[PDB]
């Protein structure tokens, strides 16, 4: 209970009603004389309310009268021109009327009416904002009224009638007003954060008697006054709290890291000390000391107007009421309660459910540590290819991507399917076409789909992943062109058939001799058999082998499939090259280290620039004139040398793409001529596709180099040497760009040595 | 020596231990159950979506994304965590909003796994979106004959600062 | 009822979205009227208003590329730029882990832009950093040489150009026109000009204007506002010195003993910051600030049940976060509260609107079940709080060490591995790396480990032996 | 005048600044990240704002320049207006003519260095 408000009396007041300050009054309206406060409380809609509480009951509420106009800022005090009884002033927009709440008994507890009596009223020209009340001048027995208006002027009424009016100077948005008795001032606070404070007698002969600029507006402004040893004035801003002296300058000041709405400054307890209360929009009270937290508490809403009072016999209970109707009478809670688990017998933890979810849980984990077809077709003929997708849930988030190629490029990448009824088909339909000169490494490309299960643990969908590929035809990236009799380098495949018509074998290609041009320029000759039953691919580009090698031994397939036979081979019994591939290898890495030479010199033009401009920053800031001293022809210098340099990373990068590329193509073939020069199976050839095609592209931290020369150093490792010494000598393998290519040539050509004697790969 | 000193505090605290330590005991047992159950209850929900970055099968990975502006470099670190056992066929699978993020090549096969090396695998992020829009990405490491993710990973990309 | 009347008193609820709203009726009903135009221009601003003072971002030009500090080698405890981190968690090399993260702190610098870049984005500042730290009205249709006469129109449209458009340069504008308006005796105009210069990066400009504004009438706002420019020059002893200034003019705010407390923690000496904080709660009581420093402080120095105290109070007060309940989960089971424990852990798991502090709670369940026994639990709270945050380094290190207890240890030298590629500045992966390494062997990755380890937190021992260890065998 | 202009070129010039700041740190990031054509977009825009902002130095230069003149006659006229008078009333009319511009009191200052 420590540090909140404990409840006492306490109601909602209407029907999504609206209060404001002001509304919340707290007196003897009723004129009884035995100190017992009223709480009367009137909204902008009408009600007027008055309640006398005892501590839900149904005779707490005096009266719930209504009236046709809004009311604001309900007042209790001196308003009537004859007696000294206390009177009620309630302030519509437009109108002013004091009241007499008149009780009468009868012989039972709810047999007692009260009656309000329309003592007097006054139109009201201007349209009223807010008011005070107080004996103005040093009359007694009396209470005028000050009233505002929205647009600034200022009417004071003398309890009976219009006394007069004068216009505030230079206001615009009317800010709280009070009336100081110790200096017969009206104080208010301007919109332009000036605290004013002018004297009545000068308002009642039109002027400022003084200022004071406060750092904001002020919600509030309570002028106390209990106290006669040395007076005060309280000004709560928005962003913070002042009390000032009579004179007109601070006497002390509070920043609020909050944002106040409501605060009353109390009875005090020490001597010329204040205690006050102030509440946050963070439904709290803060009760300072002037300057120094005594106390605080945590309010069940938003206080606006609260107000302290003696009710029915306890002294000092505090009366808020919230602006959307809540009202509620409170004391303190000052109870440290201890903190300890409630000891509760009948609660008792539900062993059989809790174990059975728990079993299966624990299942699930024990059991796991131990929906989509796709189909892809190719159109006969810039081919087009058309994707279907056939579900068998009900699926949703699918999206569907293409992947060629570099050179190959996509008139559609990605497509975008929501939920999907089940059952239901989806075709896309996207074209491919070679876009550069190099041929690609591969014809093929693949085609996945990710997509998503809704289920019951996330409903949001379990992510699921599945691929199709595609395999494009030569006629996409090939025509036929002219042979040529000799060319740089050539290999053979010795089939052990007959050697068959290329026309046959290649038709879209109309001799036993043909010849192939890629878009590119670039020229492979095939060569068939007439005594032996090899065939030969010729050209000056290894590279150029790779493709219509692969087409080549798939066409033969295909073929001698069609034709039913059975045994059929491609041995190329010979010299497996390993020296035409690694010039390719050499040009892949003197590129690598040229981008590396030009990033580091990119590098220090970047630093230098920056040097230079931290110098120019500075003699901009400095206000003194001075030479420039040619600063701006060294930053001009350094500019043109970084966008040089740049230009130069830039085709350094393309550069290293093609070589990658060409180099991709190149190993391609090797392994094809790896696969056929020793009977190697689907596993073996598994193992040296992802060994020797690890990457797509090279990237500054990794590239193909090390990459795959750890790979074939983990491959000798583990299953090709059994030597401890070497294995840790040579046999070594890191992810750094090397400092030459010697150690990846010595691994591929004792690779291929150690696949002769006759060893085998492996993975454990 | 440096050896403590108690206040009130931890006397009337013991008071209290030496008074009420059976309750004690049985609420601590019972919240004991309740987390182990919910614990459980976590784990085997994320074996469902498979969104432990760390998940016989031995694989390890995390991304980091670097650099402000509208292009961040998204640097996926992968690592085989095994005695002796490279993993031949894998590959990674992003997954983003088509509409805030422009990933060039949103599914690569990744290197043969060496056991004990970390591999960088990078990519290039780019922001779309005119107005600073925070998407998550989600990324699948997984094999190629399977359908469901070996293991997933988050990043929330950060604000684009763009132009 | 009136619509200017109840726009106004809806302000002064502070609703702004209804005054903004009945406002914009009044002005499409009348293209003439200047109290409904200044009070939507309020509402708007106020909607968006967050205070100068405790927004000091500082971006990542302003920590490298921008010098003013005058000294560039000032003597070790004058310069900004307790528990060893064996007992405290570390974010950098030093600066352990604080209580109450504001918008200011900066907790370590970086000494490259690259470094600044390849970290974490948050690892400098409590926001990831930066490069730099119908329309109602139409900036550039209006002639500030004419609303600079009107003052209570020009201070409501100054605030509506510096904090809800950001428009530094015309709001300079505006300010110089009403400073030279109201022939320079207006203290908030002079503060305002110094804020705009502030945030245009001319301090010592600033700097004149809150001195010239301090001359007028002192305040606590031009206080801090000296306070953050002398900050902003590497000049610690100077803010100090005007703190107490200003305690001499207001003998007990809360605002200045929180400053004085905060430069104290920067320069890292605590012994002094926990007695002003400790004036701060003599003054307060309910200060969050004051309060969660000195719980943490309690709580590190083994003393975690005057930290469950703190933490308690806060409770009190009507916080109800995350990070509290948490906190209080912390202390109930480190103070041995065995009731209280766990079921704040609850909370903190329900209150968590992130997917960092979820991790960070089911690792520090993983810290209860360890410290129970029970390592599978520990296990799977370390898991979940690397499913929850992947960049999670400490859960690394932890799952790492349950992992080379259970006995697989590439799985621990590969956890270790990302744990101090992630947090390189920690020192229990690295001195974890080299201590199993040294353990099979490679002693290269020991001390390469070791070595880092030393780097992290120079002080420790056993990094020390193991030290002498690997030089040892090098001869 | 030459006041406000000095004034508003500083704000101006110091908002460049930042800019070219922050330019600064997204080109360092680009050229770490290797994305060159963003680098060199970066460096046209603060090859660009160097030349605006080393306009915006020649202008204020010059201003500078005619205000430090400017300050130095107003100095000069007190100096001769004093000047003018021997002994105890010339001290006078110094701290008069300098109480006479901190009130830009001008009608009252040429008073004090017509008739003292």
Redesign the interface.
Known sequence: SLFKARDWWSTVLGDKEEFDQGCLCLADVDNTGNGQDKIIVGSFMGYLRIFNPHPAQAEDLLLEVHLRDPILQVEVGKFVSGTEMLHLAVLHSRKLCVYSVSGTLGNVEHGNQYQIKLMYEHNLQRTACNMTYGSFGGVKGRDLICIQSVDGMLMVFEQESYAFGRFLPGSLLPGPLAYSSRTDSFITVSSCHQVESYKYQVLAFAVVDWTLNIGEQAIDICIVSFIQSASSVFVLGERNFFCLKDNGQIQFMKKLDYSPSCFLPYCSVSEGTINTLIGNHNNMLHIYQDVTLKWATQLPHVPVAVRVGCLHDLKGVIVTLSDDGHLQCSYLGTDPSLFQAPKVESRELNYDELDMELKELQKVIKNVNKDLKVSAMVSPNSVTVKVTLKNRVALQKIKLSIYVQPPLVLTGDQFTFEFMAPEMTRTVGFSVYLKGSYSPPELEGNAVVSYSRPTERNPDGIPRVSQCKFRLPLKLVCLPGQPSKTASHKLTIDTNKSPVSLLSLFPGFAVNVMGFRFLGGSQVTLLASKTSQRYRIQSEQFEDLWLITNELIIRLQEYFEKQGIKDFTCSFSGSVPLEEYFELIDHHFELRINGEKLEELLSERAVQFRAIQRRLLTRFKDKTPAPLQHLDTLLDGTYKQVIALADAVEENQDNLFQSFTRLKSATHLVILLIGLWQKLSADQIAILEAAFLPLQQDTQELGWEETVDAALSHLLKTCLSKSSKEQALNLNSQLGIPKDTSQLKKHITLFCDRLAKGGRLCLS | LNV?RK?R??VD?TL??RE?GT???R??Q????????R????????????????S?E?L?L???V??????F?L?L?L?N??????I??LVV?F?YN?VLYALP?????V??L?????????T?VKSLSDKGISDII?V?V?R?GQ???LL?????M??S?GL | MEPLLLAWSYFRRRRFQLCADLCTQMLEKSPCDQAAWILKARALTEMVYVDEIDVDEEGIAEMILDENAIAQVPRPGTSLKGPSPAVRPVTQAGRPITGFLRPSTQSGRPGTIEQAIKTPRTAYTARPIASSSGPFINLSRLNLAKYAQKPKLAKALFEYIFHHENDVKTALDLAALSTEHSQYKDWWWKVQIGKCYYRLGLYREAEKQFKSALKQQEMVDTFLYLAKVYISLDQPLTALNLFKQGLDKFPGEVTLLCGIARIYEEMNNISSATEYYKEVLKQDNTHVEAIACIGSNHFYTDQPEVALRFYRRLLQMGVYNCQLFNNLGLCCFYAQQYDMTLTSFERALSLAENEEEVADVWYNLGHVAVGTGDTNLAHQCFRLALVSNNQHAEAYNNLAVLEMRRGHVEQAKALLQTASSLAPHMYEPHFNFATISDKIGDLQRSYAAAKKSEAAFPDHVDTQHLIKQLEQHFA | EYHSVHQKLSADMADNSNLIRSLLVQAEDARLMRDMKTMKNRYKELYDLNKDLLNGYKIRCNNHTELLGSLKAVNQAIQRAGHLRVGKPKNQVITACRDAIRSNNINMLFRIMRVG
Do not use: W
Request: net charge positive; proline share 10%; charged share 20%.
């Open positions: 403590p206040t505090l931890y605290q209290r231990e009420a309750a004690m005991h609420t601590f019972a919240d004991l159950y309740l987390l182990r159950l614990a459980a209850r976590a784990y085997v929900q994320a074996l469902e979506s498979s969104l432990s970055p760390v016989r031995p390890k995390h991304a980091v670097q650099g402000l502006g509208p292009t470099k640097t670190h690592q965590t095994s005695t002796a056992r490279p031949l066929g699978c997954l088509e090549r949103a599914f690569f096969k290197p043969l060496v056991p004990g090396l970390n591999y960088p695998l990078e290039f989600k699948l997984l190629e359908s469901t993710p997933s990973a988050h990043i929330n950060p604000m600062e």
